[PDB]
Amino acid sequence: TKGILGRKIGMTQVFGENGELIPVTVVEAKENVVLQKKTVEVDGYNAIQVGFEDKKAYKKDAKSNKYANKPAEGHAKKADAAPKRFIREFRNVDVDAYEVGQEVSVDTFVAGDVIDVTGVSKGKGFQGAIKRHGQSRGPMSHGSHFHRAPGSVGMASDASRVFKGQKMPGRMGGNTVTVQNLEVVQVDTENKVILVKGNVPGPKKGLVEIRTSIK
Amino acid sequence: SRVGKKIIDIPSDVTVTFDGNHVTVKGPKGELSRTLNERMTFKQEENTIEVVRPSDSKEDRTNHGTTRALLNNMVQGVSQGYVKVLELVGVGYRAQMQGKDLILNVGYSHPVEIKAEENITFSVEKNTVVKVEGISKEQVGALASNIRSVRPPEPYKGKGIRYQGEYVRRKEGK
């Protein structure tokens, strides 16, 4: 049900209804090819594999991730295509169609269709307790020695240990988050880009998979 | 102990045949229904099933009055077929039918719909009222009762739809 993979480019704004201002996120979805599919007889569930950007050659003197390896190259030769960089699975779409080896599209979604965006977060690293969580700080005057720090972490003799999940200082980092109820304002087929009304998680030039509002 | 030798007839448009733990009433009156009547020692000799199973167990005297009546209500309501009337207390019930989906109204901004099942006939001589039929009171009954209790009739001032006739607790205030 309209499954594709894109890459966050930046952000901007456009005008639509009479004179309303709507901020959008420029997503760039280029060459998208479908790989091997999974059936309920062999695998055990219905799902289709899809690649993204292509790489160079393989089996040479490369040491970076720019070139592919025998394993990947060999698995990409079965679909009669080039080695991809990003690979994901869509078990929410139909497996009856999407002939293996054939590419996807970019005009599959029509302006006004509800979609769901998914991706990793930015990342801040080791954070505090009033930053990672919504905790408040203590007084800064009246001879106080308690500022940006956590308070009590348990009772007294009731329990001689700390309960699991006490919201202690840690590393925020970036976990995979999904945003629902997202609409498509426009869809360009010349530059193969999609305009989503709102903001998606992740930094610049980052992976971002789109789907269809399951509701 | 309660009702021991109350061996009554089975003069039917039907017959009874016993193999399992039950009966089955095939008759032009009502064609081929039954549940499992009784895991008691059930006989049916020349016309009827009045089988002297239970005695000397406290459970047995309610088992008698229950399972002679599982057989009894089944065979009769599937032979006889008897649902009585319901009431029309007020102004402005919109009584009708749409197959197996009737209609009324109570004074809701939105008449909410109710639909029923078959094997309990949807019988409508009803213009602001209810009066239905079917075969087995076990299956016309709970529906003769979902229809009882739509807007529980004004226990002060008259409006509602209800059963064949009683008194309601009629209350007064300022």
């Binding site: 704004q13 004179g19 309303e20 201002l21 | -």
Partner: protein, 122 residues
């Protein structure tokens, strides 16, 4: 952004000159309020003559604040002071005159009687 303990300049002819908001009615937890909101305040400075006296608890709708008010077209509008009009608990002004301009957000707040005396309506 009009929170608790804030002095505003009433732009009416009732008899008040300055009031101090006591509570921003609107819900449990409400802190601030923008143009098109009702707040409960008290007269801190009045004038010899009128119906409202000093030390009276009355209601009023804040109109034209220092903070901006974003629209739907992407345009903003901010004044150089924070004013307000005293109501009569019926979406109606206690006075009959209004000084200074007003915003066009009172029309959506069912205040057609307050946007019929204001000289300008930006």
């Amino acid at each position: 952004m009009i929170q608790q303990e804030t002095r505003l300049k009433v732009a009416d002819n009732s008899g008040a000159r300055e009031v101090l908001t006591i509570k921003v009615l609107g819900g449990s937890g409400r802190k601030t309020a923008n143009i098109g909101d009702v707040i409960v305040c008290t007269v801190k400075n009045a004038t010899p003559g009128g119906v409202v006296k000093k030390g009276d608890v009355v209601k009023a709708v804040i109109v034209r604040t220092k903070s901006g008010v974003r629209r739907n077209d992407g345009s903003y509008i901010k004044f150089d002071e924070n004013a307000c009009v005293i109501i009569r608990d019926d979406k109606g002004p206690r006075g009959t005159r209004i000084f200074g301009p007003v915003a066009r957000e009172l029309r959506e707040g069912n205040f057609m009687k307050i946007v019929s005396l204001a000289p300008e309506v930006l």
